[PDB]
């Protein structure tokens, strides 16, 4: 746009006469006025056309300088829905994300606990673990123990107890008929006090069998000894 | 802005024309009509005239309502363009960030993962351990233990047996010649293998070797008792 | 929008003045020229009202156009206005979850190290325990066990010891006494008989006061074995 010639005026004759170029006596006094008037007419007029092809040449400057703004406009409106499209697909693309790691760290909050509770579970179980272990070592009889490590139950074995390697005590020994008579307790000794007479006419005798009576009345204090304890019946 | 002066329009200042205010008989007949087709011709020129600067002064109008929603549009495209890039910079901060708890949530997904594994493995062998800790109790002898225990075993002890704090037994007697005969346990008692005489007599002597048989019988009893069992050579 | 009637031309219909057709015997030579100058003067603002009329429209054209675009600007500005504020609020939005996964996350963190400062020590007493068993296994007598135990102590028992069962040794029995003399493990006749016939005969009695002698010293064996046991006092 913008069309030069539209700020270039017609000029018209600057002459603006009256009676001193004007006949004598020809015409109406209304024709004078006429034409004068004619001629500021022409003058006046010459002027709009003149004003107006200025304001349309300004027109025309205004429309390509705002046609500059307009071009630029879109370009930055441009630009902005580029960036703005953009803007919403990370917008989304972020929402999704603080989602999905809302349940990766929900799942792993579920589970940390059921850790926590069942570590909790381990401990106490390992506790009372420990405590019977600790039981066991206290009394346990063992196999090593150079020591003498007694026991306030009986024991009952199964052939046979043995020390040393070489058996000591088997079963009961069965078949008995016990004793009966008085225990012998005290004073005795397998020296030979007795004997004789050589002939005889002094008896005694009796010295041999008073002797073989004590005998087996301990013979029935050994005997019962052992049957109390079990050896035999 | 619209230049007010464009819509006012040149005031003719001038009345019309009409011939019988000319000079008749003094101007040509070609003058005649010529000052009549002039007559038109300045008012059709005046109108034209003054219409050109009617359109301009409306394209003049337009042109000042449309730079004030001109700048508008400015403002409000320049307003957009600074929150965007505000908005530019949150949006790079947050996804950043999230990039970012990202890996700690892996890290910690890893290693909750770990902690799972190895508390299964602990309930593993934690199990195993109560297990045949329960079965250690259940099989072992105890010192402390009121109730009598069988051993379901020949047992083996290395000096000696007690009882009540006192040995019972020990290795086994050494260096015994066995006894010979048929030994018996049936009937024995504290007989009166006396009764003797003033004079001698065979019947009671005899008595007394009786009794002396069944003693030694009841001796080699009682010996195979003890090597039976162990306790004698 | 653009008025189109701003390019009609008016046409001048007074004819150019031909000199001749004046009336020169009456017209001053002043008012000959201006009167020529006139003529010429109005097809010239002819020429430019016309001009300045198609001028005002060619930026009346433009105005048109410029108002289209304009309002699709507008148009647009008003809709990135409307996404702006939708994504102003979605990316404070997701900031705020952002941090507040944060707190949970480092929280999250403190918690899994606390757990595997007790899962590592349980792994520790988990391993004692297991080798504090495995010894225990090593080293109790079963009290279910078929082949035979050794014990490497002395062994004391409450009350007694039992084979099969039965009782077979308890109390060691007290108030005893030590048979005195020399005790015989040596050889013992196959329970030999005697010979007893009608007198005396001192041989027929040596002979049983003989093996009386022998009967009580082998006897004191047997008590002596069985003190050295621990059997009787």
């Given at each position: 746009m913008a069309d030069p010639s539209l700020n270039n005026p017609v000029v018209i004759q600057a002459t603006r006469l009256d009676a001193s170029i004007l006949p004598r006596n020809v015409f109406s006094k209304s024709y004078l006025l006429y034409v004068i008037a004619q001629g500021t007419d022409v003058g006046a007029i010459a002027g709009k056309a003149n004003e107006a092809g200025q304001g349309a040449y300004d027109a025309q400057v205004k429309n390509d300088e705002q046609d500059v703004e307009l071009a630029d406009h879109e370009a930055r409106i441009k630009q902005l829905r580029i960036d703005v499209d953009d803007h919403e697909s990370r917008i989304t693309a972020n929402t999704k994300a603080i989602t999905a790691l809302n349940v990766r760290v929900t799942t792993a909050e579920g589970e940390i606990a059921s850790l926590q509770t069942n570590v909790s579970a381990l401990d106490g179980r390992v506790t009372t673990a420990e405590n019977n272990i600790s039981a066991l070592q206290a009394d346990?009889?063992?196999?090593?123990?150079?020591?003498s490590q007694s026991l306030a139950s009986p024991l009952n074995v199964t052939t046979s107890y043995s020390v040393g390697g070489k058996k000591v005590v088997g079963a009961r020994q069965t078949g008995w008929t016990a004793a009966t008579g008085t225990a012998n307790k005290g004073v005795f000794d397998a020296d030979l006090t007795f004997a004789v007479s050589?002939?005889?006419?002094?008896?005694?005798?009796q010295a041999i069998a008073n002797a073989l009576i004590t005998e087996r009345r301990r013979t029935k204090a050994m005997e019962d000894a052992l049957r109390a304890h079990g050896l035999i019946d």
């Amino acid at each position: 746009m913008a069309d030069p010639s539209l700020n270039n005026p017609v000029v018209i004759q600057a002459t603006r006469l009256d009676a001193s170029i004007l006949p004598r006596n020809v015409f109406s006094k209304s024709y004078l006025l006429y034409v004068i008037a004619q001629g500021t007419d022409v003058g006046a007029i010459a002027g709009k056309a003149n004003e107006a092809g200025q304001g349309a040449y300004d027109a025309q400057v205004k429309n390509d300088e705002q046609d500059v703004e307009l071009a630029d406009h879109e370009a930055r409106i441009k630009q902005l829905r580029i960036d703005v499209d953009d803007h919403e697909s990370r917008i989304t693309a972020n929402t999704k994300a603080i989602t999905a790691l809302n349940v990766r760290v929900t799942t792993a909050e579920g589970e940390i606990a059921s850790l926590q509770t069942n570590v909790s579970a381990l401990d106490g179980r390992v506790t009372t673990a420990e405590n019977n272990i600790s039981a066991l070592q206290a009394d346990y009889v063992s196999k090593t123990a150079t020591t003498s490590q007694s026991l306030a139950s009986p024991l009952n074995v199964t052939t046979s107890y043995s020390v040393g390697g070489k058996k000591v005590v088997g079963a009961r020994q069965t078949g008995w008929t016990a004793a009966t008579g008085t225990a012998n307790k005290g004073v005795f000794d397998a020296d030979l006090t007795f004997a004789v007479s050589d002939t005889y006419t002094q008896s005694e005798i009796q010295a041999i069998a008073n002797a073989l009576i004590t005998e087996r009345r301990r013979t029935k204090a050994m005997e019962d000894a052992l049957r109390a304890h079990g050896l035999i019946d």
